[PDB]
Design a protein around this ligand. Structure first.
Ligand code: WNS
Length: 460
């Protein structure tokens, strides 16, 4: 029974509006409705993993698990196994997997982050799950961010708090936040970013939606504009949106957007918006392809419509050789030539690097770099040919070329990371000097760059 090199993952996000779901929600899991939808010929083919995020979820965990599992069993005739379930207030994540995957899944972590302070602490935040699927680390975040058209900056702040404080994945990756801990990270939820057009334009927006003309609306979508200005979700991907705004509907139909200010909305307008989103970030040169991204049309208990996204994701096997795990394989090495970090910091400490990778027995600390001044004000930290030779556990190129090296540049004075990034070992050649590059971030914001050359020796 061979190990897979690809799986498919279903991501759902649905703000349930504190109402129980209708009796049938199968269209969600089938990726049917509006947008990039799944072919009918696939309807009986189960996804490998289903990850369901809800917000304003009024159900108990038990109640929702019974609906989800019976939904999937009706579609696929498979009884899915529960990998994890975690709830913060009314924000919930469920991970279900095909039974054949039970002994491929391990290291399951759950966590939550509560956003805001005093006033603004008590219903927004995020839940998440991570696990290993054979050799591949997977992370999933369902966030319910701050509401209201004039709170995009708060949403951006919520995002940074969640990625700083959500404690998922391998705790030994201490310099790295969730945006670096996983082969594949999926972040979804009621992100609550709005279409930023004047209130007076509400009926014009509705007209555009009825004509399926989204271009002039998407050009004002706050998540797309904040991401283009590098204010949020730096280095994440999102499929093109080709479905109608998923908020705010009159319940029990989809024929009406309810946008006008009401006491129940705090006298705020809710112009039609793409509140409900799925984004991802995968390590460089790992296969990930979005195969659906859309909304359902026939689930109408909430003022939001459910959103679905599906992905092909590359996975790797739990590799064993005669040498590693449990020792190094002297026929493998990773060398760095002519490396330097360019940092945005105004500070003047010495810096050193740490290399972290599950291809190493443990992380590797470099010597301190040599600081120089860049021509446009920058700090340049030069490592030259001084970086330690990395000793992978396994030399087989079928393993090593699928690996990644995480890099943190740390202050000698504080041991605090000033920047994190990731280098793929999926090189064009071995035993050949090749350019490498990663942006460096800290708390998910850009702080610099790391570039140089790599020379990878495998057993071939
Ligand atoms: C609800 C948690 C039950 C559980 O232990 N799930 C699990 C763990 C490891 C691998 N696969 C699965 Cl389904």
């Amino acid at each position: 029974q061979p190990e897979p090199d690809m799986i498919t993952i279903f991501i759902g996000t649905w703000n349930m509006g504190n109402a129980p779901p209708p009796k049938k929600i199968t269209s969600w899991f089938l990726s049917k409705g509006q947008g990039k939808t799944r072919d009918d010929s696939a309807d009986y083919i189960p996804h490998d993993i289903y990850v369901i995020g809800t917000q304003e979820d009024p159900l108990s965990e038990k109640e929702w698990l019974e609906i989800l599992k019976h939904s999937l069993q009706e579609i696929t005739s498979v009884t899915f196994k529960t990998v994890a379930i975690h709830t913060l207030w009314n924000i919930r994540i469920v991970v279900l997997a095909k039974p054949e995957h039970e002994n491929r899944i391990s290291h399951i972590c759950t966590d939550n982050v509560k956003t805001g302070i005093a006033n603004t602490l008590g219903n927004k935040g995020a839940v998440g799950v991570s696990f290993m699927f054979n050799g591949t680390s997977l992370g999933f975040v369902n966030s319910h961010l701050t509401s209201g058209s004039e709170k995009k900056l708060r949403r951006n702040q919520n995002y940074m708090n969640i990625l700083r404080f959500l404690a998922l994945g391998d705790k030994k990756l201490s310099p790295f936040n969730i945006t670096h801990r996983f082969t594949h990270l999926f972040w979804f939820g009621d992100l609550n970013y709005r279409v930023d057009l004047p209130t007076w334009e509400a009926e014009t927006i509705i007209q555009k939606i009825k004509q399926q003309q989204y271009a002039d609306l998407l050009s004002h979508d706050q998540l797309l504009t904040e991401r283009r200005e590098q204010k949020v979700f730096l280095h994440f991907e999102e499929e093109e949106i080709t479905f109608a705004p998923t908020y705010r509907f009159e319940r029990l139909t989809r024929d009406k957007y309810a946008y006008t200010k009401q006491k129940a909305t705090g006298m705020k307008y809710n112009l039609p918006s793409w509140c409900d989103r799925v984004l991802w970030k995968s390590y460089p040169l790992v296969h990930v392809v979005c195969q659906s991204y859309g909304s359902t049309s026939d689930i109408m208990t909430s003022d939001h419509s459910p959103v679905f996204a599906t992905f092909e994701a590359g996975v790797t096997s739990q590799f064993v050789s005669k040498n590693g795990p449990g020792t190094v394989d002297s026929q493998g090495q990773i060398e760095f030539l002519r490396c330097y970090a360019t940092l945005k910091t105004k500070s003047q400490t010495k810096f050193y690097l740490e290399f972290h990778s599950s291809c190493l027995e443990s992380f590797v600390k470099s010597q301190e770099g040599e600081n120089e001044e860049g021509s446009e004000g920058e700090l340049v930290v030069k490592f030259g040919e001084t970086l330690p030779k990395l000793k992978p556990i396994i030399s087989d190129p079928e393993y090593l070329l699928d690996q990644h090296i995480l890099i943190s540049i740390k202050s000698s004075d504080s041991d605090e990371s000033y920047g994190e990034g990731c280098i793929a070992l999926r090189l064009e050649a071995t035993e050949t000097q090749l350019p490498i590059y990663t942006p460096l971030t800290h708390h998910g914001e850009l702080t610099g760059h790391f570039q140089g050359e790599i020379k990878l020796q495998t057993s071939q």
